[PDB]
Amino acid sequence: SKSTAEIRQAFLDFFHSKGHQVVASSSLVPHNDPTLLFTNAGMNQFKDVFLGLDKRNYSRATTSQRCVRAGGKHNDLENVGYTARHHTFFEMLGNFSFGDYFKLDAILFAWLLLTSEKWFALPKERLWVTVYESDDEAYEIWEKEVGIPRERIIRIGDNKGAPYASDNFWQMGDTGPCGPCTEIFYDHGDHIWGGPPGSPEEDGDRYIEIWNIVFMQFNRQADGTMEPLPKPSVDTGMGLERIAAVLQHVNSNYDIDLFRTLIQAVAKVTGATDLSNKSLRVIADHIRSCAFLIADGVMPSNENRGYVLRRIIRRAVRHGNMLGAKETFFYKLVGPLIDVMGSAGEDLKRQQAQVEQVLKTEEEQFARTLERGLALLDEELAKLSGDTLDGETAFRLYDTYGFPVDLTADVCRERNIKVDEAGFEAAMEEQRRRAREASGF
Numbered sequence: 001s002k003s004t005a006e007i008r009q010a011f012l013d014f015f016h017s018k019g020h021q022v023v024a025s026s027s028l029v030p031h032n033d034p035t036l037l038f039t040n041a042g043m044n045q046f047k048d049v050f051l052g053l054d055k056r057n058y059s060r061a062t063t064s065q066r067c068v069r070a071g072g073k074h075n076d077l078e079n080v081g082y083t084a085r086h087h088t089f090f091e092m093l094g095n096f097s098f099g100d101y102f103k104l105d106a107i108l109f110a111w112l113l114l115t116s117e118k119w120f121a122l123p124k125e126r127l128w129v130t131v132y133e134s135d136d137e138a139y140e141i142w143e144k145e146v147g148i149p150r151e152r153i154i155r156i157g158d159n160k161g162a163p164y165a166s167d168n169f170w171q172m173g174d175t176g177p178c179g180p181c182t183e184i185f186y187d188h189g190d191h192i193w194g195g196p197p198g199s200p201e202e203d204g205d206r207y208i209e210i211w212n213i214v215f216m217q218f219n220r221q222a223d224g225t226m227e228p229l230p231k232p233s234v235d236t237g238m239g240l241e242r243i244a245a246v247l248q249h250v251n252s253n254y255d256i257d258l259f260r261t262l263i264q265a266v267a268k269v270t271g272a273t274d275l276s277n278k279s280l281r282v283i284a285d286h287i288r289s290c291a292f293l294i295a296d297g298v299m300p301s302n303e304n305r306g307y308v309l310r311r312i313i314r315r316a317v318r319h320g321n322m323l324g325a326k327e328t329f330f331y332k333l334v335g336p337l338i339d340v341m342g343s344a345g346e347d348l349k350r351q352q353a354q355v356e357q358v359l360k361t362e363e364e365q366f367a368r369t370l371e372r373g374l375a376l377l378d379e380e381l382a383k384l385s386g387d388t389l390d391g392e393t394a395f396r397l398y399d400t401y402g403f404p405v406d407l408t409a410d411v412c413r414e415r416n417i418k419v420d421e422a423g424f425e426a427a428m429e430e431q432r433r434r435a436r437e438a439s440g441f
């Protein structure tokens with residue numbers, strides 16, 4: 001089967017052969033978008049093109065975009081290690097039409113790449129599609145132009161409980177380009193738990209969302225209103241890791257060549273032997289987001305972007321502790337990461353030493369309180385009555401030991417214990433009030 005690197009290249013070669021300009025991945029950190037925490041989609045760097053505010057010399061493009069979904073609109077941090085399909089850091093394979101072609105050709109390009117004997121040659125019978133319930137045009141295209149049996153074409157409405165809140169209406173953020181979308185799913189087989197999209201068991205890892213094709217139609221305003229974009233356009237994204245899993249005949253993203261090698265490296269540096277422990281997968285995921293974020297300019301801090309980075313690093317270090325790592329380990333995974341990323345790791349390779357030192361320093365800093373804080377948490381959990389850690393304790397772990405509340409919640413979750421988030425926030429607010437009273441005007 002093809003390597004992850006070969007799949008990345010083949011995707012780009014396909015679209016290039018179809019006249020799409022190959023454009024380099026943007027950074028994970030925007031310089032000119034105040035609404036965006038980290039790059040969460042291939043379309044981010046083309047936002048102004050979709051808005052009609054910018055025009056490129058090309059009207060169609062293709063990229064393999066590094067994305068982090070660990071905050072803001074699209075945040076999958078709490079899914080990591082609990083599913084076979086979710087990462088913080090991942091590559092999104094995309095094609096884009098800037099007032100060029102539209103619905104039919106977008107769908108045809110995707111179906112051709114996926115199912116043609118000349119291309120990925122996926123078994124057509126294992127592919128399912130969803131359309132936005134009101135998108136009769138997309139439904140007809142799949143049914144009559146492509147020829148998907150009706151039983152595998154699923155209509156999805158506003159299933160997220162609000163207008164335009166839907167798995168089939170994609171939004172860049174609370175504001176920005178958005179529109180109805182159609183998604184392609186692959187059935188990994190009945191040996192995996194789960195049902196098809198729209199079903200009660202849709203959330204299982206059996207039927208995996210591979211490729212989202214967005215028909216960009218609106219610019220969402222903060223008040224929730226939808227202003228039409230000047231030219232209906234196309235924004236698509238396919239998870240490189242998810243399509244690699246399909247192509248490499250495995251079911252989990254973590255079983256692709258890239259992650260198998262990386263997970264072996266995690267075992268080596270932590271001293272773990274059971275290659276099935278979920279902490280190995282969590283750490284393998286986390287080094288990707290942490291290392292690339294630092295390469296793209298983020299420094300650990302207690303505010304904004306720096307704090308999200310700090311939170312992920314510390315959670316990774318905590319998982320290393322659970323695995324029994326005896327010495328500083330996280331920075332040692334940068335080399336191994338560079339080795340599996342191919343050309344997509346060039347920005348990280350360029351700054352290897354710098355990224356390693358930032359990670360080493362952060363882990364060493366956290367180690368000043370990690371074990372002591374875990375000791376306290378164990379003490380408090382041992383005498384805890386009920387299923388919920390009190391907010392005062394969570395806040396003490398935060399204030400004294402530098403445990404982000406989500407790190408505390410992560411440890412507790414592994415023991416089926418919840419954290420009183422409201423209580424934590426009340427304690428934080430009480431401290432804010434003390435700070436105000438003491439500081440004065």
Ligand SMILES: NCC(=O)NS(=O)(=O)OC[C@H]1O[C@@H](n2cnc3c(N)ncnc32)[C@H](O)[C@@H]1O
Binds near residue numbers: 076238
């Ligand atoms: N602009 C259009 C769009 O963004 N669409 S989409 O939000 O759906 O993401 C595009 C795709 O990237 C993959 N993907 C998304 N999130 C993750 C994640 N946390 N981990 C791994 N793969 C993911 C997934 O295969 C998916 O269909």
